[PDB]
Amino acid sequence: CGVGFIAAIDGKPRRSVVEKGIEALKAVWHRGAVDADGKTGDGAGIHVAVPQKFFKDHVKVIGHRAPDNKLAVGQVFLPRISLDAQEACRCIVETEILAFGYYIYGWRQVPINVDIIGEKANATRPEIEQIIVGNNKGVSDEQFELDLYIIRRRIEKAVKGEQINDFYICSLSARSIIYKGMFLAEQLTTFYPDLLDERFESDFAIYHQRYSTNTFPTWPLAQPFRMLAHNGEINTVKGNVNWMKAHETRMEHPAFGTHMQDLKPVIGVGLSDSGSLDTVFEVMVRAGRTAPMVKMMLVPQALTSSQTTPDNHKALIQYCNSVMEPWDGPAALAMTDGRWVVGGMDRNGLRPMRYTITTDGLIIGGSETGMVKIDETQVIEKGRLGPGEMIAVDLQSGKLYRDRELKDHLATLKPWDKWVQNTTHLDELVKTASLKGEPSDMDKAELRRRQQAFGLTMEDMELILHPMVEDGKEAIGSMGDDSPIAVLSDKYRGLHHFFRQNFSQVTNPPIDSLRERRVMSLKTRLGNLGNILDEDETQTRLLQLESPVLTTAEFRAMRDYMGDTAAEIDATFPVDGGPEALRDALRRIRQETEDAVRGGATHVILTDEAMGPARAAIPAILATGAVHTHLIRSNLRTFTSLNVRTAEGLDTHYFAVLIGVGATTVNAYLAQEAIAERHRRGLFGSMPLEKGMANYKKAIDDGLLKIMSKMGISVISSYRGGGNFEAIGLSRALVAEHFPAMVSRISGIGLNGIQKKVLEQHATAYNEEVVALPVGGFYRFRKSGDRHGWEGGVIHTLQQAVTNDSYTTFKKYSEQVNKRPPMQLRDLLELRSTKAPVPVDEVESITAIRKRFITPGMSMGALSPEAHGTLNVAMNRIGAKSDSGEGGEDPARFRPDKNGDNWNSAIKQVASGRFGVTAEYLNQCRELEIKVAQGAKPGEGGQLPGFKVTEMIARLRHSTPGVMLISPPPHHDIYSIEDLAQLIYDLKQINPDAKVTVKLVSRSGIGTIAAGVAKANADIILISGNSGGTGASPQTSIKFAGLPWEMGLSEVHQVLTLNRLRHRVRLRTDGGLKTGRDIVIAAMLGAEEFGIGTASLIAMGCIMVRQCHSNTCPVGVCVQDDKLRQKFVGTPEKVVNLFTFLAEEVREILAGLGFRSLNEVIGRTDLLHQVSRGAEHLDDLDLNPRLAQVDPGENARYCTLQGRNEVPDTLDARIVADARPLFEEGEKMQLAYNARNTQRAIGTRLSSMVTRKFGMFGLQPGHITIRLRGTAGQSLGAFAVQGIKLEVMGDANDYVGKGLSGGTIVVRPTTSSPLETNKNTIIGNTVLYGATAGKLFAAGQAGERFAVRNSGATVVVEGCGSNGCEYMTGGTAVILGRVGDNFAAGMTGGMAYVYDLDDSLPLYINDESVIFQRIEVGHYESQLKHLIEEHVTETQSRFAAEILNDWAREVTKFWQVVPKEMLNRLEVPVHL
């Protein structure tokens, strides 16, 4: 996995470039997916220049005459099975090349060697050939390249015409060639011996290797591509393709001419994201622009409103963002035009990219700084690429442009500043709109009648509205969602309940939004779409709004500006139309929209303003979906905009789905009327109305940003009309016809059900005599409302059965709960066997069945210590497993009690916050667990209120007492699957006996993610559902996010069985498990272990108050008080009895069905049947996609291996074979070794042995020391304990000092290095992630996210990058240089010192929660002096030395940064 590019600066071809590319490719085998075969790869490739002399000598030998101009050679993949496809494709190519007039020299068969390819990579091997075409018309290179591109496109279209399969063109150009395939990285020069020739010299080279998630290779899917190479994964492709489908209908350029016609469907079929991006990039380059300009236009910089850039770049970025939609996502790009060679990064800068210049005029860049061996006395400058940066090389003139120089040189081509001034805002338009035209308020009775027509209750106004108007933030709930799903419910559930939101597992990182909110934009532009292949002042003349949501006054002002060009359309249908009124209304509106747009209209306002007693309102979602889809399909969406006036928008989940469907702006007027009516009654106090409206809009925008950030999209323009939702319970026809791209794995109600529901509610509201709104139960139970899962009768009966310890009571409980009408998916299925029953005494004992149950994780921050300890003791008594969850654990509980009760936990979690993760915390468990996303709040981090943190929790988490602690949504260690494999390797090295468990959340596409994580040596997968509890999270994330585990579990099982991977991993599920029937159904689906969770809390005393976030739970389960903790009534015997009953129920059911063990029922899906609720509901749920049976073959249907999946050994092994005197006599040692980038986690296993022998703090500092010479790998010294000293001479790649636990790391350049130690990067990204103790001294600059989540470490580094010291918690950090933008964001504890010569810190710092001043206390001066003295002592630096020399005049150049919450708690005050 990785990209790389080598370039000769002067611009002269030479062989060293090519071979060095090969050498760099030969050393990326550690990041790839290891396979037991040793021959099967997953894609590799190189991209070089054309060796003219080679092919010219070939032609000369053949018998022709070598021409004077350059040659053109095209590499093609033809089919291999039959002999017609080859001949047909050859005929097509030759007829299509000769139609222009060029001369064909002949075909050539590339020599290959199939001895190295595996099997599955050989069954689809295509026939590789080359065609040699020469230019005889004497045209220029420019026109020649143009016709070659046009010929390639025409050949592709013509071949696709005849539906010929497995045909591909890897290149057709006169400048560059591409050698790619499905082999291993190191075996590239063996499969293609041509590259071993002496005449293959070039002036640039790009190389790439990928890491696929499945095990079915397709040769045309290997990178690099033609004028592109991509590392990472793009988020927004379902929306960018849809917008390209509208951009195509107006674009044209005179360079192409009539031939423009065959490039209309630019993004074909059968491509990935890296293919569509490449196609768009190539089209935009071939029309006049240059590679830097296209890279800026597609992947722009983050437009931030600070004074740290010249206004030229701001105007340029404004133009670029105005002309095109960005292509977000983690992306490290290495692209090449015919002249330029560019290496660039995305907006957030997630992937790493490091480069190096040598004295030979040679630049080498890639993912790792140790790929190409280079003598240290040959370097000139080392560097990196920050967020949005780029580095370019011009081969024509032979020059090297860095970031700022390239920006300056690019900002002078066109007068951007004079062009951007054409933009018109609405803020000025609403300011100048005089305060007239105030409309009279609606009557109370009319408001109530309209609110009743949509099903709005008073709990929608007192619970989820009032906090918005008062606080400016959003509502909060604290328990799982036990509400029935939308289709099975019986009340009026709005259409916006059928759409679940989306998020990102390991393959993509979610974007946290409370800290780097500066890179997220909500800009909206009307009058924007047009020709994307132009450059003029008319392209930047439009209307710009700062938020897609508009109030009523802003809507009236914008309607003023629109005026005499807009067209309004009603969205109401007659109630008495008949059985097909809704469909006819849809038809009518989608015809009138097209007939009005063709008439010159430019703005469409879709409103339901005419709703009355005889006209029902069409659901706004359906209306805007139909209209947007029709406008896209008729090549008219490019002409107009789409404004919606709705009467149901009250929650932040409505606006999300409306903007996701395709609407431009959304106006919600009924909510504003309700706000005004509630204000006139004197309910908010003394605040004005405009302040309330501003607070409401701010809360809406914050919630919209939260919803947009769960997936990784940072701009609204690329999220609109992409539809990243998922419908559960809608008919396949309806979704596939009216909505752009959503999957409905089970069909649901069509149009008749929607019409019936709408008409029923309308009749109830407009014919019945309303006096007040119903109370309504959706978040809390009310007798008039809906049904729920956990309620009074069942809870009391369960507590009685568990307390009295009698089984018949528990059967009464199960009988009550298994008799309600269906509420979940697993209620419709039915067990049905064909064998004869067997007696009860013959099935497995309760012991071996109870050992299959575990308890999910519940942090100590949420639960009380007594309940946590009770669970840990109860689960260890029966031999099962418990869980500690996030928030760490008490060390003093690490020994068995003398009651015998073991308070330890057998499963430890590694959250994304790393709040208590140390070296001892990971060596005191049997089985580990990685938590990627939680069931209740997917794509989000756990929360903990500011008053829940006492001394005990603050000491247990190494944080500040009385401070809100919010975990980061992303992981900062897991940005892609290769990083997940790296982290799994780390975890398996630090603990040599435990297993690694990955926890996902059920959704669509989880099958490929599961097949990918199984190749990363993970051995247990956990699938949670949307029905899980939580400690504290917003209500929208609880009710409108996730999916039932019935879908995800079956999907993962089928996908894992299909890839021959099921026999290596285990499956575990939880969420909503209550009885034995549920457990038997889950075991039939494919699971092997089961988690219980909430039910256990009910056995201990919880009574479902749903006030866990208030710290006032009555019984005393989740509360951090003392007066309330004294009311606990839990005891382990209750939990033991619950588990015993639950297991013996499974025994009952198994004996009644006809089997004798759970191993004989797992996977046997054919024992389940589907029966529907009857002929009076007509929901067409077909669970057959859920009951499909994939045949395993020879393997079993469960895990059949012993122990964990094994891993190779790094250098540490040799160390353990050398430092035996240290472990047996306990004496000092000293070792020296040579490091290389193919060696990961150096010094971790040794730390494990030291921890097991002496402990974390048993050895004096510097007991064992190692001296590495070379380039260190990744995760160098991760989880190192005190007593170990690593000294690296060279550099470290990434994650150096991750989770330091008291050790000591020192990085310095070579003594013979001619480099300025304060101007060259020496360590990469994410340094000191979640460290608690130790020291780290570096003699260079660090990467991005330097010292994130630091807790006790001390670091001295000569530089930093962007987002440094983000969300730090404790320790000291000295930075002797410049910092990056958004420095010290979310910092809440510790201290920092910056050495400021530029006097430019107040421009970069995030002055939100920290204060910055100058040193005024000698006590804080001795600290800095001693730190710099220790730095000089260890690294022998020269910068810090001369800083220490001139101390009296440089002490006044330091800024001291201290958190705001550390102002009352420091030991001596910072002031005078």
Ligand X SMILES: Cc1cc2nc3c(=O)[nH]c(=O)nc-3n(C[C@H](O)[C@H](O)[C@H](O)COP(=O)(O)O)c2cc1C
User: Counting beta carbons within 10 angstroms of the beta carbon of residue 306, is it exposed (0 to 12), middle (13 to 18) or buried (19 or more)?
Assistant: exposed
**Phi and psi for 255 in degrees, rounded to 5?**
-70, -35
Largest CA distance in the chain: 100
Closest to its own copies by CB, 442 vs 736, is 736
Neighbour tally for 101: CB within 10 Å: 11
121 CB-side CA count, 13 A: 23
Q: Total residues at the site for ligand F3S (CB under 6 A)?
A: 13
Closest to ligand X by CB, 935 vs 1334, is 935
* Minimum gap (Å) between residue 1124 Cβ and ligand F3S: 10
From the list ligand F3S, ligand X, its own copies, none, pick the one residue 533 interacts with, judged by a Cβ distance below 5 to 8 Å according to partner type.
Answer: none
Q: Which of 39, 64, 157, 160 binds its own copies (CB under 8 A)?
A: 160
Report how far residue 1333's alpha carbon sits from residue 1297's, in angstroms, rounded to the nearest whole number: 11
Q: Which of 494, 509, 1028, 1243 binds ligand X (CB under 6 A)?
A: 1028
Q: Which stretch binds ligand X (CB under 6 A): 197-205, 769-777, 1022-1030, 1133-1141?
A: 1022-1030
Report how far residue 1089's alpha carbon sits from residue 1068's, in angstroms, rounded to the nearest whole number: 5
One symbol per residue from 1194 to 1213: x for binding its own copies (CB under 8 A), - otherwise; what is it? --------------------
Q: Does the annotation mark 1 as catalytic? A: yes
Q: Is 1096 annotated as a binding residue?
A: yes
From the list its own copies, ligand F3S, ligand X, none, pick the one residue 856 interacts with, judged by a Cβ distance below 5 to 8 Å according to partner type.
Answer: ligand X
Does residue 862 bind ligand X (CB under 6 A)? yes
Q: Is 1156 annotated as a binding residue?
A: no
* Count helices and strands in the chain by DSSP H and E runs: 42, 47
Q: Which of 508, 1024, 1054, 1318 binds ligand X (CB under 6 A)?
A: 1024
Q: Is 93 annotated as a binding residue?
A: no
Q: Which of 162, 428, 1160, 1227 binds its own copies (CB under 8 A)?
A: 162
Tokens 């959250």 label which residue? 911
Residues with Cβ within 8 Å of residue 347, at least 6 apart in sequence: 299, 300, 301, 302, 326, 328, 387, 388, 519, 714
Q: Total residues at the site for ligand X (CB under 6 A)?
A: 26
The secondary structure of 893-940, three-state, reads HCCCCCCCCCCCCCEEEECCCCCCCCHHHHCCCCEEEEECCCCCCCCC
Supply the angle between the helices 1132-1153 and 1076-1085 in degrees, to the nearest 10: 60
Q: Is 1100 annotated as a binding residue?
A: yes
Site for its own copies in 254-273 (CB under 8 A): 269-270
* Minimum gap (Å) between residue 1055 Cβ and its own copies: 7
From the list its own copies, ligand F3S, ligand X, none, pick the one residue 1030 interacts with, judged by a Cβ distance below 5 to 8 Å according to partner type.
Answer: ligand X
Q: Which of 1128, 1143, 1028, 1146 is nearest to 1081 (CA)?
A: 1146
Closest to ligand F3S by CB, 108 vs 1127, is 1127
Q: Which of 100, 107, 947, 1447 binds its own copies (CB under 8 A)?
A: 107
For the chain, the straight-line distance linking the first and the last C-alpha, in angstroms and rounded, comes to 55
Q: Give CA angle at 881 (875, 885), nearest 5°.
A: 95
What residue is closest to ligand F3S based on CB?
A: 1113
Tokens 């300009």 label which residue? 293
* Minimum gap (Å) between residue 720 Cβ and its own copies: 24
Residues with Cβ within 8 Å of residue 330, at least 6 apart in sequence: 232, 233, 346, 348, 350, 351, 508, 509, 712, 975, 976
Closest to its own copies by CB, 602 vs 634, is 634
143: helix, strand or coil: helix
Given the residues 1, 170, 320, 1365, the one annotated as active site: 1
Q: Which of 4, 372, 71 is nearest to 224 (CA)?
A: 4
Tokens 């109030």 label which residue? 551
Closest to its own copies by CB, 1180 vs 1421, is 1180
Tokens at residue 1084, please? Answer: 């039939």
Q: Is 471 annotated as a binding residue?
A: no
From start to end of 216-265, where are the E strands?
Answer: 230-232
Does residue 939 bind ligand X (CB under 6 A)? no
Neighbour tally for 47: CB within 10 Å: 28
381: helix, strand or coil: strand
Site for ligand F3S in 1096-1125 (CB under 6 A): 1097, 1102-1108, 1113, 1115, 1117-1118
Q: Is 1236 annotated as a binding residue?
A: no
Contact 1275, 1286 (CB under 8 A): no
Contact 295, 512 (CB under 8 A): no
User: Counting beta carbons within 10 angstroms of the beta carbon of residue 1441, is it exposed (0 to 12), middle (13 to 18) or buried (19 or more)?
Assistant: middle
**Phi and psi for 238 in degrees, rounded to 5?**
-75, -15
Give alpha helix (H) positions in 426-532.
427-432, 444-454, 459-462, 466-471
From the list its own copies, ligand X, ligand F3S, none, pick the one residue 676 interacts with, judged by a Cβ distance below 5 to 8 Å according to partner type.
Answer: none
Q: Total residues at the site for its own copies (CB under 8 A)?
A: 44
Report how far residue 709's alpha carbon sits from residue 653's, in angstroms, rounded to the nearest whole number: 14
Closest to its own copies by CB, 36 vs 83, is 83
From the list its own copies, ligand X, ligand F3S, none, pick the one residue 737 interacts with, judged by a Cβ distance below 5 to 8 Å according to partner type.
Answer: its own copies
* Minimum gap (Å) between residue 1097 Cβ and ligand F3S: 6
1128: helix, strand or coil: coil
Does residue 1093 bind ligand X (CB under 6 A)? yes
Contact 1006, 983 (CB under 8 A): no
Q: Is 1052 annotated as a binding residue?
A: yes
Q: Which of 509, 777, 885, 1371 binds ligand X (CB under 6 A)?
A: 885
From the list its own copies, ligand F3S, ligand X, none, pick the one residue 95 interacts with, judged by a Cβ distance below 5 to 8 Å according to partner type.
Answer: its own copies
One symbol per residue from 989 to 1028: x for binding its own copies (CB under 8 A), - otherwise; what is it? ------------------x---------------------
Rg (CA), the chain: 33
Does residue 1070 bind ligand X (CB under 6 A)? yes
Neighbour tally for 499: CB within 10 Å: 24
* Minimum gap (Å) between residue 829 Cβ and ligand X: 19
What residue is closest to ligand X based on CB?
A: 1093
Closest to ligand X by CB, 155 vs 1001, is 1001
Site for ligand X in 125-164 (CB under 6 A): none
Does residue 1094 bind ligand X (CB under 6 A)? yes
Residues with Cβ within 8 Å of residue 1246, at least 6 apart in sequence: 1212, 1215, 1216, 1219, 1264, 1284
From the list its own copies, ligand X, ligand F3S, none, pick the one residue 857 interacts with, judged by a Cβ distance below 5 to 8 Å according to partner type.
Answer: ligand X
* Minimum gap (Å) between residue 801 Cβ and ligand X: 18
User: Which amino acid belongs to residue 1040?
Assistant: F
Q: Which of 1077, 1067, 1055 is nearest to 1009 (CA)?
A: 1055
From the list its own copies, ligand F3S, ligand X, none, pick the one residue 1073 interacts with, judged by a Cβ distance below 5 to 8 Å according to partner type.
Answer: ligand X
* Minimum gap (Å) between residue 1093 Cβ and ligand X: 2
Residues annotated in a binding site for [3Fe-4S] cluster: 1102, 1108, 1113
Residue ranges in contact with its own copies by CB under 8 A: 83, 86-87, 90-91, 94-95, 98, 104, 106-109, 111, 114, 123, 160, 162-163, 165, 269-270, 731-733, 735-737, 743, 745, 747, 1007, 1051, 1055, 1166, 1180, 1182, 1184-1185, 1187-1189, 1191, 1193
Residue ranges in contact with ligand X by CB under 6 A: 480, 856-859, 862, 885-886, 931, 934-935, 942, 1024, 1027-1031, 1070-1073, 1093-1094, 1108, 1118
Residue ranges in contact with ligand F3S by CB under 6 A: 479, 1097, 1102-1108, 1113, 1115, 1117-1118
Residues annotated in a binding site for FMN: 1049-1106
Catalytic positions are 1
Residues annotated in a binding site: 1049-1106, 1108, 1113
